[PDB]
Amino acid sequence: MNYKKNLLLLYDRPREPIFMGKGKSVFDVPDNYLTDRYRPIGPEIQNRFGELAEERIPVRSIALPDLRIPMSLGRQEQFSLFIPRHRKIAARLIDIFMGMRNIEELQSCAVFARDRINPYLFNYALSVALLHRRDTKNLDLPSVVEVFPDKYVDSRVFEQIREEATVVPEGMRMPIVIPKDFTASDLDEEHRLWYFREDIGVNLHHWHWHLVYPGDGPDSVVRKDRRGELFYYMHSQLIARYNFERFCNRLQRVKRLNNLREPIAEGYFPKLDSLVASRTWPGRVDNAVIKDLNRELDQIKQDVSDLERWIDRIYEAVHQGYVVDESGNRIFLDEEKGIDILGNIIESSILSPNRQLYGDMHNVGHVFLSYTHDPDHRHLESFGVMGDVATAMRDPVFYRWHSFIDDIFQEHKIKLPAYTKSQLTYEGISVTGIIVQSEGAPVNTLHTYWQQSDVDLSRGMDFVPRGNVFARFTHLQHAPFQYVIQIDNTSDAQRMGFVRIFMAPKNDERGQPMLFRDQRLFMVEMDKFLVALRPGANRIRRRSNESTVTIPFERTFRFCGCGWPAHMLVPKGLPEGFPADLFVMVSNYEDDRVVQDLVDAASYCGVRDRLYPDRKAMGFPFDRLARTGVDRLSNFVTPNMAIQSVNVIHIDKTVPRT
Amino acid sequence: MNYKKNLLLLYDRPREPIFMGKGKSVFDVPDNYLTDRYRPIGPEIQNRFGELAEERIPVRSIALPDLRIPMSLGRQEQFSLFIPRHRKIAARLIDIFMGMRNIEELQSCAVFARDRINPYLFNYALSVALLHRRDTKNLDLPSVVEVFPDKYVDSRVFEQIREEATVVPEGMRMPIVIPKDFTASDLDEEHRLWYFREDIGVNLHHWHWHLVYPGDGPDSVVRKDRRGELFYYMHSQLIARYNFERFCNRLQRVKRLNNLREPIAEGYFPKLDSLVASRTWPGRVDNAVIKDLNRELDQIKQDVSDLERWIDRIYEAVHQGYVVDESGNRIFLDEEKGIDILGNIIESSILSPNRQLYGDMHNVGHVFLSYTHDPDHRHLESFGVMGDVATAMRDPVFYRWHSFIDDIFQEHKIKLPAYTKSQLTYEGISVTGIIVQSEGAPVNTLHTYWQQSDVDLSRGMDFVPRGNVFARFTHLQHAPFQYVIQIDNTSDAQRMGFVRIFMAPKNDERGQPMLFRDQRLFMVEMDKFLVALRPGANRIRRRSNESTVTIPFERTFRGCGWPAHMLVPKGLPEGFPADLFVMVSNYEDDRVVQDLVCNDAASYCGVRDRLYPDRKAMGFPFDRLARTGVDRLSNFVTPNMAIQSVNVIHIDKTVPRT
Ligand SMILES: [Cu+2]
Ligand SMILES: [Cu+2]
Ligand SMILES: [Cu+2]
Ligand SMILES: [Cu+2]
C-alpha cells in the first residue's frame, strides 16, 4: 500500500525535520505537530520544501498516547539497549507504536514523535513495531547502515562526502572508499580481526538479533520459542567463529575476563563520530580497570560487587541443578529447558524467573566495560561502543566478556548426560563420505579473498545536497562451493533425515590435533537441512548459498530477514592453507521434528514461526561431553556421521563485487 | 591595496576549495592550480560558482617554491606547535610566505598552496607571515574563532548550526546558544573555572601570543627582545590570574605536578571535535599515567627519563649560576639577562644556547601530557587538548604543568639580591593615594557579572549554506572604572615616572592577611604607562579600558594583549577583598636607549617594536625576595608606592551587551 510505503519515509534522513522532503514525497504536518522551534515560523517553513515534491501526504491530527517517557531521553544523547533506564524507555515506545489502532494512526503518531524523540531510539522502536505488527509484515525496512552510517564508518569520510556532494554535480560524483583496518596499527596484534569485528554484516547481524528477540517490551514481541537458548547459542557461535579467525591470524583462543578487578589489556578506540549526539564515541585505554558505577541521569548505581554477587548466585543455581523463582518454588534445570531458563537468567530478559536474585549480569557487564572512563558522570561523557548493541562487537573485550559468560553456560552443559551410542545412531543410515568442490579449485578446498561492495548512504546524510552517495566497503568473501554427501539407506523404505554440517580447526594453537573436549566448542554450524533418503544409495548435492545459517548477500548489501551474513560463512584461513575438520551427521527427522502440523523445515524465522523446528539442543551434537571412551572426533562418530579434511586457502587479492 | 584584502579572503571557509565563492568575490584560478581531483572537472566547476559574485580576482600563474615539506602534513590530520616535526614544517611554510617579492606573488603562492596544505597549518603559517612582512603591516586579520569554530565550541552545536542554516532561510534564523560549563559536573570542583579556562578570549590570547613570539621559524620572526623573559612572565601572570579566580571559587592555589611519575589526579574531557581532522581531542581519565612516547609519524621517541634529565640539567645550571654553550663557554645567569636565557632554554626556542643539553622541556611535557591514552600510536589517536596551543589552556593540568615550570624560574629569581630601599624610592616623588571609581558604585569597589556576546561563525562553517550564523557566548565581564592617583612631586623640575599597577588577594585560602613571601607571587599586573609629573601635586585619572595589559573588547568579539572582559577577577557576591598596589618608578633609570616611532605611547607590539620599553625586569618590583626586615606589603612600600583596600563584587546576572 501507499500507507505502508509512507512509513518507510520515516527512515529517510533521521535528523531532517519531517516537513522536509522525503524522496518524492512530503508530509503535510498539522500545525500542532511542529516542534517548538519551528511552529512559530511554521507556515513560512513548510511551504519552502512543500513545492518540491511529486506526492503530498496528509496527516490527520489525532489524540496521541503519553510520550513523556519516550521523550525523556535527549535528542543528542546516545541510545543503549544495555542501560536499564533506556530499555524501559524503549519498551514504552514499542508499546505505543504496537497499540495504534491501525496503520493510519501509526503514521500519525510516528510523524508527531519523530522530531521529538532520540533518532536511534525512534529507529529501534519503530523497527521493532513494524516487524511484529500484523498490518506491516512485508515492508522491506532499510538497513540501519544506510540510515545511520555514523555507527559503521570511519568519521573521516563524512566531510569527504559533504565536499563531494557540495562541489561536484550529481552525474560526476565518485564513490567514497571506506577505510578498513583503521582503528589501530601493527603494534596491536588485535587489529588483525578488523575483517570480523568491524564487518558491516557481522555488526548488522547483532542488531537484527536484538530487533527480533528484545529483552523488554510487550509480551507479544518478547516471548519467542526457546529465546533463552538462542541467546546462548548465538553468542556461542560468535565465539567459535571468532576463535576460528584468531587461528588464521597467528593468535590464541580468546581469553575470558578472569576477574573483573584485574586490568583489561586490550584497549580499543573506535574512530566513530555520532552525528546524532554530535559527539565522538569514547575509547578505552590499554589496561583499564572496571570502576563502580554512579550515574544519576542513567539511573545506574552498581558496585562491581553487585555484579560479582550475581555471578556467584548463578553458578550456585547451575551447581544446585535448579533456580528459585520469586514465589520460592524450584525450577529444575533439566536437559530440555535448562539452557533456556538459564539464557533468560543471564541476559536477564523479563522471562527471568527471578531478576531480583539473579540480576542483569550480561547487560550490566556491557555498561561497566563501556564507562571505565567516566563512572560517576563527573566528566559528562557518554558510553563507549560496548554500551551499544550496534557497535559492541567492534571492541575486542566483547569477545572476552562473552567468552566468560559462555563458561557459565558450559558449566551447565557439562552436567548433562553424554549422548549415548543409541541416541546418536540412525539405524541403516550410513554416511560413507562428504567432500566440497569449488569451481576450478582442488577437491576439499575452500577459498577466501577480499571484495569491494557499495552501499548507498544518501538516506543517512542529513543536511547534505540530494544525490546518491555510494560508499565502497572492503570485506572478506568466499568463492562459491557445494557439498557432495554419499549416504546408503539399506532399510527397504524411505528415511527422512536432518543433515547437520559443522566445521572446526583441525589443530590447536600449537599444531597438534584437537581433542573432542575442546574441539566440540570450536565447531561452527555451516548448514542444517532436511532430506528424503531413498532405499539404496543417495548422492546429495548442497550449494553453499542454500545454507540455512546464512542470509543472502543482498540482505546486507542492496523483508526476508536476517541470519549470518553470507560473505562471512567461511573463516579466512591462511595463504599457505589452514587445515579444518568438516563434519556431517544425518539424524532421524522423526525424532527431531516438531509437531508443527499444517492443515525448508530447517530455516527458522523468529518473527514468522511459532516454534523453532528442531527438538534437539541448538548445537547438536556437540553441546555435551563425549560418552566414555571417546577422546576425539575420529572416534566420536557413528556410521551416520562422517569426517573430511578440508584446506582453507586465502588469497590476499581484491575483486570488484563481480 | 586590493591585494591585501584578497589575502583575507583565504581565511574564509578554510576547507571549502578556493574556487568556490569567498566573500562577495571569486578567484580565477589557472587550470594547473587546481588540485588533482578537480583539474579534470575544472570546466564544470568554473561555471558552477562565482557568477553570483561581484568582484572576480585574476591570479597570475607563477613559478613556486618546493612545497613538499608543508604538504607532508596531511589535510585531515591534526596540527600542534609543541610537536618538533610540526614546528619545523610551519617554519618552512612561514619561510616561503615571507620569501615572496611582491604582495601579488604572495597571493599566487597562497592561492596555490591553500587547497593542498593542512588548513590549521595554513592559517597559522600565513597569519605569522602577514604579521611580519613589511608590505602587509597593520592588517586586521580575522579571528581564529570565526574561521575554526571547531577549536572553540562544544561539538554538539555544529549540527545545531548546520540544521538552522539548512532549514531556516537567512532572514529568519535565530542565534545558537554556546553551552557554558559543559565539560564537567559539580562532582568535579575544577568545573567552577569554566569562565576562565574555557573562555574564548583567554584561549585566543594564548594563540595570538604564539603567533607573535613563535619559537621556531626565520630568525627575523623569532628573535624579539627579551622573548625568553616574556615567556616566563606571560606564563607567570596566567598562573597569577588563575590563582585569583581559584580564590574566588572556594578553591586553593593551584598545586604543581609533583613530578612525572605520580598519576595526574585531574582528568579532563573537552567535548571538542576537529572538523579538519574528523577526530577528537581525546579526554584524559582521572589518575592517568605519563608514559614514554614512541610516536613514529610525529618523530617523537622520548622517555620520561629524557625529560627528567633535562629538568635536572636546568636545575643544575640555575644553582651554578650559569649555562654552558655548545662550544663549552659559560654564559652567566645574571640580574639582567639570566631570566631571558633561562626562558629560551626552558621553552626551548631556537635561541636556547644548548638544546642538546637542556632539551625542549616545556614543549615536550605538553606533548607527554597530551598522549597518555596512546603513547606509541598503536590506537592511531591524536593528542589531547594539551598538545595544542589553541586549546591547551582548557585543561586543569595546564596550570599544574606551568606551576611546575614556574618553580624552576622562581629558583633563579630567589638567587638575585633583594631590591634595596635605594633601588625602590624615587627621591622627591611620593604617592599619597590611589582609589578606584566605578559608575553607580561606592569608591574602592570593582563589579563583575555575566554577559552574552554574538559572533558570526559563517566564515567557518564549511559546506553549510551561506548567510549569517550567530553564536551567543556567555562570559565574565566587569563594570568600567578609573583609577585616581595622587602624586606629590617636590622637585622644582618635571619628573617622568612609570606607573605600575598590580592587584592581589588580601588574604590566603584561610582568610588570613597574606605575607609578602606569598603575596608577591599573587600580584596581577593591571596597567603600566608613563606619566609626566609637574612640580607639586598631580592628579592622574586612568580608565580601565586604557590598560596596557589589555586589548579592546572589539578585537575578541565582533598588538598582543589580555582580553578586556577578563581584566578583573570574578570576586564574590558577598565581596572579595584585594590589595591594590601602585608604584611610581624613576623613568630616567627605566628608560631604554633605543628611540623609535611623545614617550607616553606605551602600546607595545613585539613585531612592531625592536626593543622592550622598560629596562626593569618584567614583574618589577615583586619579582625578587624582600630586602631584610620586610615581611608584608605594608613594610615593603616606599613613599613612591601606595596601597588601597578594594572590594571585588560578583553579581550572578546576565546583561545583553549595551
Ligand atoms: Cu547480543
Ligand atoms: Cu553482550
Ligand atoms: Cu604558551
Ligand atoms: Cu606550555
Sequential DSSP letters for B484-538 = EEEEE--SSS-EEEEEEEEEEESB-TTS-B--HHHHGGGPEEEEEEEEEE-SSEE
Distance from CA of B180 to the nearest CA of A (A): 13
Q: B-chain residues within 8 Å CB-CB of A48?
A: 169
For chain B, how many residues are written? 658
User: Is B168's CB within 8 Å of A271's CB?
Assistant: no
Residue whose C-alpha cell is 551587551: B657
Span from the CA of B143 to the centroid of ligand 4 (angstroms): 22
Which ligand is nearest the CA of A231, by number? 1
As annotated, the binding site of B for Cu(2+) includes 206, 210, 235, 362, 366, 402
User: Is B38's CB within 8 Å of A169's CB?
Assistant: no
Q: Is the peptide bond before B513 cis (omega within 30 degrees of 0)?
A: no
Q: Tell me, what amino acid is at A408?
A: I
Q: What is the sign, positive or negative, of the torsion defined by CA atoms of A396, A399, A403, A404?
A: positive
SS3 assignment, position A153: coil
Residue B627 falls in which region: left (phi positive, over 0), alpha (psi -120 to 50) or beta? beta
Residue among B284, B298, B380 with most chain A CBs within 10 A, to mutate = B380
Q: Where are the beta strands (DSSP E) in A138-183?
A: 176-177
Residue whose C-alpha cell is 555451516: A526
Of A207, A191, A379, the residue nearest A268 (C-alpha) = A191
Q: Tell me, what amino acid is at A163?
A: E
| A271 DSSP 8-state letter | -
- Angle CA A274–A277–A282, to nearest 5: 60
Task: Report the DSSP pairing between strands A564-565 and A550-551.
Answer: parallel
CA-to-CA distance for B422 and B417, rounded, in angstroms?
13
Distance from CA of B277 to the nearest CA of A (A): 7
CA-to-CA distance for A161 and A415, rounded, in angstroms?
55
Span from the CA of A281 to the centroid of ligand 1 (angstroms): 19
Residue B306: other Cβ atoms inside 10 A: 17
Q: Is the peptide bond before B70 cis (omega within 30 degrees of 0)?
A: no
Of B580, B392, B348, B558, the residue nearest B471 (C-alpha) = B558
- Angle CA B117–B122–B127, to nearest 5: 165
Using N-to-C axis directions, what is the helix angle for B338-347 and B397-413, rounded to 10°? 150
User: Is B279's CB within 8 Å of A269's CB?
Assistant: no
C-alpha cell at position A42:
511554521
Q: A-chain residues within 8 Å CB-CB of B266?
A: none
Half-sphere exposure of B167 (CA within 13 A, CB side): 23
Q: What is the dihedral of CA B134, B139, B142, B144, to 10 degrees?
A: 40
C-alpha cell at position B308:
627528567
CA-to-CA distance for A114 and A14, rounded, in angstroms?
8
Residue whose C-alpha cell is 529517510: A12
CA-to-CA distance for A15 and A319, rounded, in angstroms?
51
If you compute the radius of gyration of chain A from its CA atoms, what whole number of angstroms results?
26
Q: Tell me, what amino acid is at B147?
A: V
CA-to-CA distance for A318 and A413, rounded, in angstroms?
9
Half-sphere exposure of B574 (CA within 13 A, CB side): 3
Q: A-chain residues within 8 Å CB-CB of B463?
A: 159, 162-163, 166
CA-to-CA distance for A631 and B219, rounded, in angstroms?
79
Span from the CA of B55 to the centroid of ligand 1 (angstroms): 60
Residue among B163, B167, B294, B394 with most chain A CBs within 10 A, to mutate = B167
- Angle CA A548–A147–A134, to nearest 5: 60
SS3 assignment, position B447: strand
For chain A, how many residues are written? 658
Task: Report the DSSP pairing between strands A279-280 and B445-456.
Answer: unpaired
Structural resolution in Å = 2.7
SS3 assignment, position A174: coil
CA-to-CA distance for B354 and A499, rounded, in angstroms?
78
Q: Where are the beta strands (DSSP E) in B239-342?
A: 273-274, 279-280, 293-295, 300-302, 322-324, 330-332
Using N-to-C axis directions, what is the helix angle for B119-132 and B103-114, rounded to 10°? 170
Residue B315: other Cβ atoms inside 10 A: 13
Per the CB < 8 A criterion, the answer to whether B26 and B57 are in contact is yes
Give first-to-last CA distance, chain B, whole Å: 34
- 3-state SS track over A531-577: EEECCCEEEEEEEHHHCCCEECHHHCCCCCCCCEEHHHCCCCCECCC
Span from the CA of B552 to the centroid of ligand 4 (angstroms): 25
As annotated, the binding site of B includes 206, 210, 235, 362, 366, 402
Per the CB < 8 A criterion, the answer to whether A483 and A541 are in contact is yes
Residue whose C-alpha cell is 627519563: B305
SS3 assignment, position A213: coil
C-alpha cell at position A334:
533439566
User: Is A166's CB within 8 Å of B282's CB?
Assistant: no
C-alpha cell at position B23:
566573500
Of A144, A146, A150, A149, the residue nearest A130 (C-alpha) = A144
Q: Tell me, what amino acid is at A146?
A: E
Per the CB < 8 A criterion, the answer to whether B637 and B494 are in contact is no
Q: Tell me, what amino acid is at B160?
A: Q
Q: How far is CA A288 from the centre of its chain?
A: 27
Q: What is the sign, positive or negative, of the torsion defined by CA atoms of A86, A88, A93, A97?
A: positive
C-alpha cell at position B625:
625576595
Of B135, B121, B114, B116, the residue nearest B92 (C-alpha) = B121
Nearest residue on chain A to B287, alpha-carbon basis: A373
Per the CB < 8 A criterion, the answer to whether B528 and B500 are in contact is yes
Q: Bridge partners of A300?
A: A295
Residue whose C-alpha cell is 581469553: A255
- 3-state SS track over A278-319: CEECCCECCCECCCCEEECCCCEEECHHHHHHHHHHHHHHHH
Which member of A159, A188, A373 has the closest CB to residue B285?
A373
Per the CB < 8 A criterion, the answer to whether B545 and B564 are in contact is yes
Produce one character per residue of A213-240: b if its CB has 16 or more CB atoms within 10 Å, e if not. Answer: bbbbbbeebbebebbbbbbbbbbbbbbb
- How many residue pairs from chains A and B have C-beta atoms closer than 8 A? 140
Residue A347 annotated to the active site: yes
Task: Report the DSSP pairing between strands B537-543 and A430-438.
Answer: unpaired
CA-to-CA distance for B614 and B527, rounded, in angstroms?
13
Q: A-chain residues within 8 Å CB-CB of B373?
A: 269, 283, 285
Per the CB < 8 A criterion, the answer to whether B565 and B578 are in contact is no
Residue B161: other Cβ atoms inside 10 A: 22
CA–CA distances in Å: residue A479 to residues A438, A441, A544, A655, A657: 7, 9, 9, 11, 12
Q: Residues near A76 by Cβ (< 8 Å), separated by ≥ 6?
A: A276, A277, A278, A279, B156, B159
Of A255, A298, A193, A212, the residue nearest A572 (C-alpha) = A193
Residue whose C-alpha cell is 565574565: B476
Residue whose C-alpha cell is 587550470: B31
Per the CB < 8 A criterion, the answer to whether A308 and A302 are in contact is no
Q: Tell me, what amino acid is at B57?
A: I
C-alpha cell at position B329:
663557554
Q: Residues near A327 by Cβ (< 8 Å), separated by ≥ 6?
A: none
Of A154, A159, A143, the residue nearest A394 (C-alpha) = A154
Of A520, A522, A524, the residue nearest A626 (C-alpha) = A520
Task: Report helix, strand and coil shares of chain B as percent, to nearest 5.
Answer: 35, 20, 45
Q: Bridge partners of A474?
A: A452
Q: Bridge partners of A515?
A: none
- Angle CA A54–A59–A61, to nearest 5: 160
Task: Report helix, strand and coil shares of chain A as percent, to nearest 5.
Answer: 35, 20, 45
CA-to-CA distance for B335 and B331, rounded, in angstroms?
13
Q: From the candidates A347, A381, A439, A554, give the one annotated as an active-site residue.
A: A347
Q: Residues near A597 by Cβ (< 8 Å), separated by ≥ 6?
A: none
C-alpha cell at position B78:
591534526
Span from the CA of A522 to the centroid of ligand 2 (angstroms): 19
Per the CB < 8 A criterion, the answer to whether B361 and B311 are in contact is yes
CA-to-CA distance for A501 and A239, rounded, in angstroms?
18
CA-to-CA distance for B459 and B463, rounded, in angstroms?
10
Per the CB < 8 A criterion, the answer to whether B634 and B640 are in contact is no
Residue B380, judged by CB atoms within 10 A of its CB (0-12, 13-18, 19+), counts as: middle
Of A21, A40, A19, A47, the residue nearest A112 (C-alpha) = A19
Q: B-chain residues within 8 Å CB-CB of A286?
A: 378-379
Residue B287: other Cβ atoms inside 10 A: 11
